[PDB]
Design an enzyme around this catalytic site. Structure first.
Site, mmCIF file in Angstrom:
data_model
loop_
_atom_site.group_PDB
_atom_site.id
_atom_site.type_symbol
_atom_site.label_atom_id
_atom_site.label_comp_id
_atom_site.label_asym_id
_atom_site.label_seq_id
_atom_site.Cartn_x
_atom_site.Cartn_y
_atom_site.Cartn_z
ATOM 1 N N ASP A 35 62.206 39.936 88.949
ATOM 2 C CA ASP A 35 61.155 40.622 88.218
ATOM 3 C C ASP A 35 61.744 41.659 87.265
ATOM 4 O O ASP A 35 62.092 42.768 87.688
ATOM 5 C CB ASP A 35 60.219 41.304 89.217
ATOM 6 N N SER A 199 57.948 43.060 68.914
ATOM 7 C CA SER A 199 57.846 41.800 68.203
ATOM 8 C C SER A 199 57.390 42.076 66.775
ATOM 9 O O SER A 199 56.634 43.011 66.519
ATOM 10 C CB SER A 199 56.871 40.874 68.935
#
Length: 330
Positions: A35, A199
């Protein structure tokens, strides 16, 4: 040193991925959920409340000659999905794909929430976010990656998740045969303890690319792609009959649909998520309403590039003094 381990979907939807991890001496192999959005290595154990264990493999520290109680240490964690666990702490030897750390904090669960009990396939979590998020008190502990880092050939790990198929976590090297083209690297902020990056934009299907900054985290422990409501609405508007259902808890769509792809930007590069990756199947057994793999992050407080996004790429988690993230197509 290096390590290399195969990671395997837990079910036919890729809801999560499990990776075998050797703990203790002799080894006890548990299948852990790696994770990159948390920083605790915790396991089902011989100390877990019996009624909360249902098919998981447990770690029994009393059977490990290298286990030592970390005296006074406790831990307690809550995840974004509302699940939680807590317990005490041992140090022990932990190996992943041939890479061994001695003195790793292994957090033994005394209690786990129902979501964990109900998932027989996940024996615990191995956190790979920054150690500043580790919950051990009163002495915070380091992640497996942080402990291994100095010994690694290169201070990196890579995630290569499969679509409906196994993939690979590598530690200490970049497998140049595992991706196509070049890897595009992008800046990381560690201020919130996550692999947080920006992004450069998105496209829906064959549509034009929208240049827009989207801050979010690369999180292998989250199933879906969570993005701003504007972006998510633009995606689902291209699927006939799709709608946001408050009763179901997100966007659903007719199972008869063909989903468009979704592209996200990494610098000037582009990662394409095929439409099929965005299908999470019937909302309930036999339903013709299917659950979407792109959902709104509104009310989470952060955008999350979970497995839906990451499995479309070869992803480098570069833990150099100034960390960065790399993405390649594959």
């Amino acid at each position: 040193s290096t390590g290399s381990a195969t990671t395997t979907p837990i079910d036919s939807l890729d809801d999560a991925y499990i990776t075998p991890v050797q703990i203790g001496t002799p080894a006890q192999t548990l299948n852990l959920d790696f994770d990159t959005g948390s920083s605790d290595l915790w396991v089902f154990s011989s100390e877990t409340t019996a009624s909360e264990v249902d098919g998981q493999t447990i770690y029994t520290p009393s059977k490990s000659t290298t286990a030592k109680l970390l005296s006074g240490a406790t831990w307690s964690i809550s995840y974004g999905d509302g699940s939680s666990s807590s317990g005490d702490v041992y140090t022990d030897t932990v190996s992943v794909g041939g890479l061994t750390v001695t003195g790793q904090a292994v957090e033994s669960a005394k209690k786990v929430s129902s979501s964990f009990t109900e998932d027989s396939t996940i024996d615990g979590l191995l956190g790979l976010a920054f150690s500043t998020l580790n919950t051990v008190s009163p002495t915070q502990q380091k992640t497996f990656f942080d402990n291994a880092k100095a010994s690694l050939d290169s201070p990196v790990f890579t995630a290569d998740l499969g679509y409906h198929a196994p993939g690979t976590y590598n530690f200490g090297f970049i497998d140049t045969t595992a991706y196509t083209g070049s890897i595009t690297y992008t800046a990381v902020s560690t201020k919130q303890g996550f692999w947080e990056w920006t992004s450069t934009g998105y496209a829906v299907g064959s549509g034009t690319f929208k240049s827009t900054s989207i801050d979010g985290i690369a999180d292998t422990g989250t199933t879906l792609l969570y993005l701003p409501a504007t972006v998510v609405s633009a995606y689902w508007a291209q699927v006939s009959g799709a709608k946001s259902s408050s009763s179901v808890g997100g966007y659903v769509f007719p199972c008869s649909a063909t989903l468009p792809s979704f592209t996200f930007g990494v610098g000037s590069a582009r990662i394409v998520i095929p439409g099929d990756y965005i299908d999470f199947g019937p909302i309930s057994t036999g339903s013709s309403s299917c659950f979407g793999g792109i959902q709104s992050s509104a009310g989470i407080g952060i955008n999350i590039f979970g497995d839906v996004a990451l499995k479309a790429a070869f992803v480098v988690f570069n833990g150099a003094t100034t960390p960065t993230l790399g993405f390649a197509s594959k």
